[PDB]
Amino acid sequence: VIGDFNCTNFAINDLNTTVPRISEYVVDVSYGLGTYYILDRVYLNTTILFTGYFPKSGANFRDLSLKGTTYLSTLWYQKPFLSDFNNGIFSRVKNTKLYVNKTLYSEFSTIVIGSVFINNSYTIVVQPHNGVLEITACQYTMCEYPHTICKSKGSSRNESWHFDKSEPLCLFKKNFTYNVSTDWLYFHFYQERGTFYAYYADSGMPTTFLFSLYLGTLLSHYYVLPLTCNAISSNTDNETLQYWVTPLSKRQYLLKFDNRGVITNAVD
């Protein structure tokens, strides 16, 4: 389970089925994937040795996106999908582009980052709403079996990942736009000395600082929410979710900057 609130009994498989194969992809940083811009600094036409929260080059990304239709499997809400956060994670996220009457809609998996996922603890939630990225850190009563839905194409079940009837206590609540036409988003989520840090990119690969948030507590877990949809399948549109995640750690990189100060290359 994620949280411990019984939000629903509708269409749950508690059967000990085959675990879905988590797909894996090698981390290659040679074009600046997994890197970020340093503070308020510009570096031009140069190489820098810098120690930062970076992926291990040659480690694996895991695709933790889960697309459902009606049934939720209880095995989705366990290890290996429920994952240790440690220092942090780098996300490579497919922007799943869907069309309704030729109008573009942007979907991708919500991620939750927390400890115990109960309403005496803060859970960070990063959720897309079609070009708006809603980021919150609140005392959510997370569901046992949380998921999101396609708002665009609809779903056979309602969205429920928390059950707060009155507004929960929040440390953070901000919206960030992202470019809905992009094919990929990139995120760093990490923690240092009781403070959470987020970086993102929607164009190119090297991320930029979004925000930081003092928590005063260690985050221990993250989970990529299942998304349920009538579409995003071989019998509808041949679209897919992808939410690739790999651990961060304090690593020395060589960073190469071009004459615009873009990180064009990196070495672990």
Ligand X SMILES: *[C@@H]1O[C@H](CO)[C@@H](O[C@@H]2O[C@H](CO)[C@@H](O[C@@H]3O[C@H](CO[C@H]4O[C@H](CO)[C@@H](O)[C@H](O)[C@@H]4O)[C@@H](O)[C@H](O[C@H]4O[C@H](CO)[C@@H](O)[C@H](O)[C@@H]4O)[C@@H]3O)[C@H](O)[C@H]2NC(C)=O)[C@H](O)[C@H]1NC(C)=O
Ligand Y SMILES: *[C@@H]1O[C@H](CO)[C@@H](O[C@@H]2O[C@H](CO)[C@@H](O)[C@H](O)[C@H]2NC(C)=O)[C@H](O)[C@H]1NC(C)=O
Considering only 42, 79, 259, 260, the residue that binds ligand NAG (CB under 6 A) is: 259
Nearer to ligand Y, 47 or 175 (CB): 175
Min dist CB 122 to ligand X, Å, is 13
Considering only 116, 118, 213, 262, the residue that binds ligand X (CB under 6 A) is: 118
* Residue 112 exposed, middle or buried by CB count within 10 Å (0-12, 13-18, 19+): buried
Considering only 78, 236, 240, 252, the residue that binds ligand NAG (CB under 6 A) is: 236
Query: Is there binding between residue 230 and ligand NAG (CB under 6 A)?
Result: no
Nearer to ligand X, 4 or 183 (CB): 4
Query: Is there binding between residue 109 and ligand X (CB under 6 A)?
Result: no
Q: Which residues does residue 263 pair with via DSSP β-bridges, in sequence order?
A: 257
Nearer to ligand X, 18 or 120 (CB): 120
Does residue 219 contact residue 114 with C-beta atoms inside 8 Å?
Answer: yes
Q: 162 vs 21, 31, 135, 168, 215, CA distance in Å? A: 27, 38, 15, 10, 20
Does residue 241 contact residue 125 with C-beta atoms inside 8 Å?
Answer: no
- Helix, strand, coil shares, percent, the chain, to 5: 0, 50, 50
Within 20-39, the residues that bind ligand Y by CB under 6 A are none
CA distance 209 to 37: 8
- Give which of ligand X, ligand Y, ligand NAG, none residue 179 binds (C-beta under 5 to 8 Å, depending on kind): ligand NAG
| Contacting residues toward ligand Y, per CB under 6 A | 129, 132, 134, 173, 175
| Contacting residues toward ligand X, per CB under 6 A | 4-5, 118-119, 141, 164
